[PDB]
A = this chain, B = another copy of it.
């Protein structure tokens, strides 16, 4: 599908939710990293959540090879805008990708000033 970047099949979607207001968390920054050979974190994709609190088309399946990826969520800047003070600096989700072939990754995240949970729903797409 899309070359280099884009979403050739949409292999990764990040969905953020606000548990204090019961609404989707809009305009949250999401930075995604891939571990490099030197073993440090190399910038991979990034964006802000839409009106539905989702972020997709961060990457493409040709570009999304097996490796170790890190999803960072600027949760702190998010609360600061609502006048609340958070405890965390941000949230990270570190996972190895496509241990045995690609599939979709939906990284979910539920946020509160002092807590956040994160879940992954890995699904084998079809036609």
Contact = CB atoms under 8 A, between A and B. Distances in A.
Interface string A20-46: 111110000000000000000000000
Contacts of A13: none
B89 A22 contact: no
Interface of A: 17-24, 68, 84-85, 87-90, 92-96, 99, 108, 110, 112-123
Contacts of A87: 22, 95, 120, 122
Chain A binding surface SS class: strand
B22 A122 contact: yes
A121 B89 contact: no
Contacts of A68: 89
Contacts of A95: 87-89
A61 to B, nearest CB: 19
Contact of A118 (B20, B89, B116): B116
B113 A22 contact: yes
